[PDB]
Write an enzyme that holds these catalytic residues in place. Structure first.
Site, PDB file in Angstrom:
ATOM      1  N   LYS B  55      88.007   0.003   9.886  1.00  0.00           N
ATOM      2  CA  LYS B  55      89.189  -0.305  10.685  1.00  0.00           C
ATOM      3  C   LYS B  55      90.086  -1.359   9.978  1.00  0.00           C
ATOM      4  O   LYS B  55      91.298  -1.186   9.888  1.00  0.00           O
ATOM      5  CB  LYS B  55      88.794  -0.782  12.088  1.00  0.00           C
ATOM      6  CG  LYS B  55      88.158   0.273  12.997  1.00  0.00           C
ATOM      7  CD  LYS B  55      87.362  -0.345  14.166  1.00  0.00           C
ATOM      8  CE  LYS B  55      86.532   0.716  14.885  1.00  0.00           C
ATOM      9  NZ  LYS B  55      86.379   0.519  16.349  1.00  0.00           N
ATOM     10  N   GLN B  99      84.305  -4.459  19.841  1.00  0.00           N
ATOM     11  CA  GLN B  99      83.441  -3.464  19.213  1.00  0.00           C
ATOM     12  C   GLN B  99      82.147  -3.387  20.020  1.00  0.00           C
ATOM     13  O   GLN B  99      81.609  -4.425  20.394  1.00  0.00           O
ATOM     14  CB  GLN B  99      83.159  -3.873  17.771  1.00  0.00           C
ATOM     15  CG  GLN B  99      82.386  -2.883  16.928  1.00  0.00           C
ATOM     16  CD  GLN B  99      83.151  -1.626  16.604  1.00  0.00           C
ATOM     17  OE1 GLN B  99      84.389  -1.631  16.474  1.00  0.00           O
ATOM     18  NE2 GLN B  99      82.397  -0.511  16.459  1.00  0.00           N
ATOM     19  N   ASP B 124      91.811   0.403  22.394  1.00  0.00           N
ATOM     20  CA  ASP B 124      90.740   1.419  22.582  1.00  0.00           C
ATOM     21  C   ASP B 124      90.835   2.178  23.923  1.00  0.00           C
ATOM     22  O   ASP B 124      90.171   3.207  24.108  1.00  0.00           O
ATOM     23  CB  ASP B 124      89.338   0.813  22.440  1.00  0.00           C
ATOM     24  CG  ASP B 124      88.805   0.838  20.994  1.00  0.00           C
ATOM     25  OD1 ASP B 124      89.460   1.334  20.085  1.00  0.00           O
ATOM     26  OD2 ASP B 124      87.692   0.379  20.731  1.00  0.00           O
TER      27      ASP B 124
END
Ligand SMILES: NC(=O)c1ccc[n+]([C@@H]2O[C@H](COP(=O)([O-])OP(=O)(O)OC[C@H]3O[C@@H](n4cnc5c(N)ncnc54)[C@H](OP(=O)(O)O)[C@@H]3O)[C@@H](O)[C@H]2O)c1
Ligand SMILES: NC(=O)c1ccc[n+]([C@@H]2O[C@H](COP(=O)([O-])OP(=O)(O)OC[C@H]3O[C@@H](n4cnc5c(N)ncnc54)[C@H](OP(=O)(O)O)[C@@H]3O)[C@@H](O)[C@H]2O)c1
Ligand SMILES: Nc1nc2c(c(=O)[nH]1)N1C(=O)N(c3ccc(C(=O)N[C@@H](CCC(=O)O)C(=O)O)cc3)C[C@H]1CN2
EC number: 1.5.1.5
Lengths: 287, 295
Positions: B55, B99, B124
């Site tokens: 990422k 995460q 997200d």
């Protein structure tokens, strides 16, 4: 040859009697405590005035204290928000809702107004927080919009389990169609959602063991389209040359096994569910 | 006709190049402005470390400023929440994510942590507030979780419009299936959602002009089930051992690819299909957040 009639008038009455007994017992256990609903209206639409009175009358019969706040057509978004904020902070008020559609001469963003409602008082279940919990399967701790809640209850009165059934929802509105999908999906139906751009709507409807129609087009869903043996839930309230549903009732009742008439079907169950949500909010506040 | 292969590796590369060009131009148009992503990690899992590096490297190639905040295993829920709150208020930060899964020695409620994320930065797209906005039709400005975002993009690369097509989603997960429904529904498909209690799953799948399978059952959806001419999007990443491969394992989808490719018109291979679209979609969501902030 006739389908069993799901009598929303009787079934809602059973629910309201039960809730009244619940509400009586909370007052005997904690004397002076009063569950309290507030309804905020903008403008003065005649249908909204009627629907609000029905909510108020159901509430007062259950022993819920129901407050009605009517704001004029001149109202702005800022004023509406100030009331939302006051009802948020008024701790005597356990549940509240904004009646829709808003009748103002000014632009008001319905979503921004509804999303300022404290999620613990969102008895209509229209906040994004509650919508998101329902849409992703987290039913432990959200409110569910009152109309689809009522529809789910009506489906359960048949005794036919939902799991594994192919269900069809005609309509995807925030108030009924979209949350109806989610309720069906999370009770383990395989769900098909239809809308205005759906091709061959008849052949889609014909797959439905469970059918919930919420479109606002009078009698558009014909009886021929209905799967033999289906459960038909008609959310429509349409005025014609007289009130009719979104389903052609007379033709649909010969094909279906269970069906909701109009009136006396989904309508009175919507209010019972509002009252149920109001009492849950009052119960949770007692902790 | 053998099915046209949707090459996720090429398509994601086209997207990342395009975003870079977009990002360069926003800095020339509004000097000093730096789109900014933050990734918050708890613990030190090896898989999370790898995914985070990918990422960060994609972001720095695009010209996004990517901050990595790695907190030790000793961290508590309160500390995690304090960081979430600070990233919420740090106005230089346009998007951030946590995460998962969290690697702490203490109990931490993943749902309460994720739901403390400001919905305007939830790149997200997993917050309940953002899911609700997506689920009820606010695609103009909500975030879309990266896997279904990638799937929607792949469907559009076909040129075949979605409106009025019957689409089928096999799976209803928070990460893929449920947001996939919402994207399809709000692009005017008629959507049927299937899951583990669906009866006659084959006959449901066979109605799908568009099919997005996200189940985690290797190759369960056979080619026979596929509607002739369908668009098949396979989200599956299932490992099966195979000594004929360089690293001793093959990857297969949730679709029986070889039999499905004869029936479909467009299909996503595994690997090289939905997978490599993932990170590009995070970067696309990050730039949307940065663009909305610039107004
Ligand atoms: N009984 C109750 O408690 C209650 C509560 C709310 C509403 N209602 C009644 O139920 C009806 C609909 O309510 P609503 O609030 O859901 O309405 P709404 O916001 O007007 O939405 C109607 C839905 O029907 C779809 N539709 C319209 N024409 C269609 C067609 N030709 N084929 C297929 N679908 C079609 C629309 O699709 P698009 O999204 O493509 O426009 C939309 O999703 C009305 O009669 C209303 O008065 C009753
Ligand atoms: N490439 C990427 O970056 C990426 C990202 C995320 C996920 N994925 C992959 O996508 C796949 C699915 O992931 P997920 O997160 O959605 O998994 P998940 O959270 O385990 O959910 C799987 C879904 O499939 C349903 N399902 C399972 N067995 C089924 C069966 N026999 N018939 C029909 N439906 C069935 C489950 O049904 P119930 O709802 O009844 O439990 C559930 O809805 C996995 O291979 C995963 O690795 C890929
Ligand atoms: N935010 C928000 N807005 C809203 C509603 C809502 O939940 N939330 N809605 C209702 O209450 N509605 C309704 C509809 C019908 C009735 C009702 O009691 N008639 C019955 C009469 C039943 C009988 O006693 O026989 C009927 O249609 O059959 C009572 C409220 C319509 C809709 C309109 N707008």
């Amino acid at each position: 040859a006739p389908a069993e009639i799901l009598n929303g008038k009787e079934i809602s009455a059973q629910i309201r009697a039960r809730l009244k007994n619940q509400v009586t017992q909370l007052k005997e256990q904690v004397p002076g405590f009063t569950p309290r609903l507030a309804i905020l209206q903008v403008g003065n639409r005649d249908d909204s005035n009627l629907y609000i009175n029905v909510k108020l009358k159901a509430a007062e019969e259950i022993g819920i204290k129901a407050t009605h706040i009517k704001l004029p057509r001149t109202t702005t978004e800022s004023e509406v928000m100030k009331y939302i904020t006051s009802l948020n902070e008024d701790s005597t008020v356990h549940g509240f809702l904004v009646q829709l559609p808003l009748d103002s001469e000014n632009s008001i963003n319905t979503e921004e107004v509804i999303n300022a409602i404290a999620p613990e008082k969102d008895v209509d279940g229209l906040t994004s927080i509650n919508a998101g919990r329902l849409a992703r399967g987290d039913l432990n701790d959200c409110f569910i919009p009152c109309t689809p809640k009522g529809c789910l209850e009506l489906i359960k009165e048949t005794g036919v389990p939902i799991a594994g059934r192919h269900a069809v929802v005609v309509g995807r509105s925030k108030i009924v169609g979209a949350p109806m999908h989610d309720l069906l999906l999370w009770n383990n139906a395989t769900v098909t959602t239809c809308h205005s751009k759906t091709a061959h709507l008849d052949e889609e409807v014909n797959k439905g063991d469970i059918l919930v129609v919420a479109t606002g087009q009078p009698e558009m869903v014909k009886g021929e389209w209905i799967k033999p043996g289906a459960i038909v839930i008609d959310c429509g309230i349409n005025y014609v040359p007289k009130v009719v549903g979104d389903v052609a009732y007379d033709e649909a009742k010969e094909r279906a096994s269970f069906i909701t008439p109009v009136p006396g079907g989904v309508g009175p169950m919507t209010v019972a569910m509002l009252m149920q949500s109001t009492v849950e909010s009052a119960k949770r506040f007692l902790e």
